[PDB]
Structure 1
Amino acid sequence: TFESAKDKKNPALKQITQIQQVIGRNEENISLTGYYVKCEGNIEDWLKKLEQNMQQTLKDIASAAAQQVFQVGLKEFVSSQASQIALLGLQILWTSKVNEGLERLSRNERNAMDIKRNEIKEHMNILSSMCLEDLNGAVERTKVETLVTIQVHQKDISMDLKCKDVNDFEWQKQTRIAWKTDIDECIISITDWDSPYSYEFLGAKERLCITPLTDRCYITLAQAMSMYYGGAPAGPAGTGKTETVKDLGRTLGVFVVVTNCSDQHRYRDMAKIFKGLVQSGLWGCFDE
C-alpha cells in the first residue's frame, strides 16, 4: 500500500505501511508494519529502508510471538500468527519442553519426560481433527498441512527418542532452535554448527518431508559451511537435490537464487552473480 502523508508545502509523500503476498487471484497474506517506510528522491534509499524495516519488524513480531506461544495455547497463536512464525513457534516449543523433560529425567526417574511427549501426542489430535478437513482459502490451507507434516515427524522422533541428556548424540542430531532472550536473537543449531535466522518474509511455502537422507544432507551441509566451502550434491535425475538445497535455505530464513547455466555463458555474468552473493548475504544454487 501507498499512503500519502501531506507535508507542509511539499506534495504529499507516499509511504509504505504494509506488505502483501498474493497467490492465485484473491488468496493472499498481509503483514502490517509499525515502523514505516517513506519514499524520497533517491531510489536506493527507499529500497534499502524497505529491506531494513522489514527485517526489524519481523524480528520484533517474532520476539513477541515466542512469549505468546506458551502463554495462549496451541490453537490461538497458530490461528493468529503467520505461517513462518507459527512453524518457528512449534519448533521452539518442542525443543524447550523436550529439554525440560530430559533434565527432569537426569534428576531422578521421572514421568515428566513422558508427560511432555504425551502433551505433543495430545496436540496432534486437536490439530488434525478440525483445521485439516474444513478451512477457507488456499494460503490458509497450505499453512495447516505445513504444520501437520512437521508435527508427524516430530512425534515420530519423540516416540523413539531414547537419549538420557542434552549431550547425547541422538538429541544432537536434529535441527534444534533456541530464541535467546538475554541477548535477544534467534539461533538455529545442528550437531555443532550455529547461525542466526535471517528474517526474510516468505509467507506460506510448501516445504517438504524429512526422510533420513535429508538428515544426511543437513548434517553434511552444516559441516561444510562450518569449514567455509560449498556443497555440490550429485546423483541421477529427480532425487530431490535442488529442492533439498532450497529447503535448507527456507528453514534457515535466507533467500535462495537459483540460476541455470548453459553452454552460451561467459564469466562476466558469473562474476556479476558472485559479486551480488558476497555483497548481499544470499545463497546461490547454480543448477546444471
Structure 2
Amino acid sequence: RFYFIGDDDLLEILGQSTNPSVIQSHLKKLFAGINSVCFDEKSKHITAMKSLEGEVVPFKNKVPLSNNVETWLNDLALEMKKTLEQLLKECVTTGRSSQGAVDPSLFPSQILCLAEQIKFTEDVENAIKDHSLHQIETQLVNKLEQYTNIDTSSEDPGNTESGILELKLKALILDIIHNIDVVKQLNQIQVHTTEDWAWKKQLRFYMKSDHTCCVQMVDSEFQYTYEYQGNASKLVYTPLTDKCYLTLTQAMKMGLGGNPYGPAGTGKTESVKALGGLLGRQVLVFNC
C-alpha cells in the first residue's frame, strides 16, 4: 500500500514504530476506512477502530505492536478481514432465526445492509419457486413502515451524547425501496421460475458454504473482499445504474476494463465507487 504514501510519512512510520501520535496522525491516510484507533492500557495493543462520525467496531483479538512495521500491518489487514467475516456470520446467524435481530448499535451498517440483502435474496428465490406471494410484498411494505415510524424516535432528540447511528437507518431505507420496486415489477410481469432472465437480471447476493459472500449477476460472479467502508453516501437506484452495472460486470467477465462516458455532470465517477462499495473492494480514485 505504500505507493501512495509520500516518502515524508513513510520514513516516519518506519522510524516511529511505537509512537501513538504518529499512528493516529498517519494511519488514516493508509487505510481509508479507519479514521483512528484506540489503544490498550499499556499502549501495547490496538483493540478498536473508529469512523468519521464515530462508528466504533471492536476487533476480535488484540494486535501486538512491534518494531518491524510490516509485521503488525499484516496483522491489521488479516485481523480486520477476520473480524468483519466473523461479525457477518454472527449477524446472519441470528438474523435467519424467526425473531428479528434488530440491534443496530451492535453492528456496523456494512453488515446490516448485506445481511438484509442476502436474506431477501434467499427468501425471494424460495418465493418464485413456491408461489407469487404478495405476502412478501406486504411484509416489505409493513417493515418499511416500521422503520419510517421508528425514525421519528431519534429525529426529535437528534443531538444527544453517546447516541448517533440514525444513519444506519437511512442507509437501510434505500435498499428496502429497491426491494419494493423489484418485487413490484416481478408482480407486474408475473415471472414463472428462477431461470427466467427477468430475475437473473437483478443483482443477487448469495451465500457460499464457506460462509463468505459471492456477488453474482447473470453468470459472472466475484467475491466480497471485506474492505471496511464505514458510513458513506449511497445512491438512488435509477434504471441507468442497471445499464451501468450489467455492462461493467460483463466486461469484467470477459477480462476487460470499462469506459463509461457521456456529457458533463451525470454520475459516472461515483457509480464506479458505488459498485466498489456494493461489492466489498477498495477504490483508489486518481486523476490523470
Q: TM-score with structure 1 length normalisation?
A: 0.79
The amino acid across from 1:247 in the alignment is A
CA distance in 2, matches of 1:122, 1:151: 11
The aligned counterpart of 2:140 is 120
Q: Which has more strand, going by share of residues?
A: 1
Q: Secondary structure at 1:17's aligned position in 2?
A: strand
Residues 75 and 59 (structure 1 numbering): CA distance in 2 closer, same or farther, change over 3 Å?
closer
Matching of residues 126-165 of structure 1 within 5 Å:
126-131=146-151, 134-135=154-155, 136=158, 140-161=165-186, 162-165=190-193
Match of 1:195 among 222, 241, 246: 222
Q: How large is the RMSD of aligned CA atoms in angstroms? A: 1.9
Q: Secondary structure at 1:259's aligned position in 2?
A: coil
Residue identity over aligned pairs, in percent, reads 31
Structure 1 residue 74: deviation in Å?
4.4
Contact 1:101 1:114 in 2 (8 A): no
CA distance in 2, matches of 1:133, 1:160: 32
Structure 1 residue 159: deviation in Å?
1.4
Matching of residues 20-169 of structure 1 within 5 Å:
20-23=50-53, 28-71=54-97, 73-74=99-100, 76-78=102-104, 80-105=106-131, 113-131=133-151, 134-135=154-155, 136=158, 140-161=165-186, 162-169=190-197
Structure 1 residue 133: deviation in Å?
6.3
Structure 1 residue 57: deviation in Å?
0.7
Q: Secondary structure at 2:232's aligned position in 1?
A: coil
The aligned counterpart of 1:239 is 266
Q: Secondary structure at 1:207's aligned position in 2?
A: coil
CA distance in 2, matches of 1:139, 1:192: 40
The amino acid across from 2:276 in the alignment is G
Structure 1 residue 41: deviation in Å?
1.7
CA distance in 2, matches of 1:121, 1:239: 31
Q: Note the residue ranges of structure 2 that are not aligned, 5 or more in a row.
A: 1-37
Q: Secondary structure at 2:96's aligned position in 1?
A: helix
CA distance in 2, matches of 1:193, 1:146: 27
Q: TM-score with structure 2 length normalisation?
A: 0.79
Q: Note the residue ranges of structure 1 that are not aligned, 5 or more in a row.
A: 6-12, 106-110, 262-288
Number of aligned residue pairs: 243
Structure 1 residue 4: deviation in Å?
4.9
Match of 2:234 among 207, 218, 242: 207
Residues 132 and 209 (structure 1 numbering): CA distance in 2 closer, same or farther, change over 3 Å?
farther
Q: Secondary structure at 1:187's aligned position in 2?
A: strand
Q: List per-residue Cα deviations over 1:256-276 (Å, max 9, x = no partner).
A: 001111xxxxxxxxxxxxxxx
Residues 139 and 189 (structure 1 numbering): CA distance in 2 closer, same or farther, change over 3 Å?
farther
Match of 1:2 among 30, 39, 50: 39
Structure 1 residue 251: deviation in Å?
0.5
Q: Secondary structure at 1:192's aligned position in 2?
A: coil
CA distance in 1, matches of 2:201, 2:213: 19
CA distance in 2, matches of 1:159, 1:39: 53
Structure 1 residue 72: deviation in Å?
6.2
Greater shift, 150-159 or 206-215, is seen at: 150-159
Q: Secondary structure at 1:244's aligned position in 2?
A: helix
**Structure having greater relative contact order (Cα 8 Å, sep ≥ 6):** 2
Residues 132 and 242 (structure 1 numbering): CA distance in 2 closer, same or farther, change over 3 Å?
farther
The aligned counterpart of 1:173 is 201
Q: Secondary structure at 1:127's aligned position in 2?
A: helix
Contact 2:121 2:205 in 1 (8 A): yes
CA distance in 2, matches of 1:59, 1:100: 25
Greater shift, 252-261 or 138-147, is seen at: 138-147
The amino acid across from 1:21 in the alignment is S
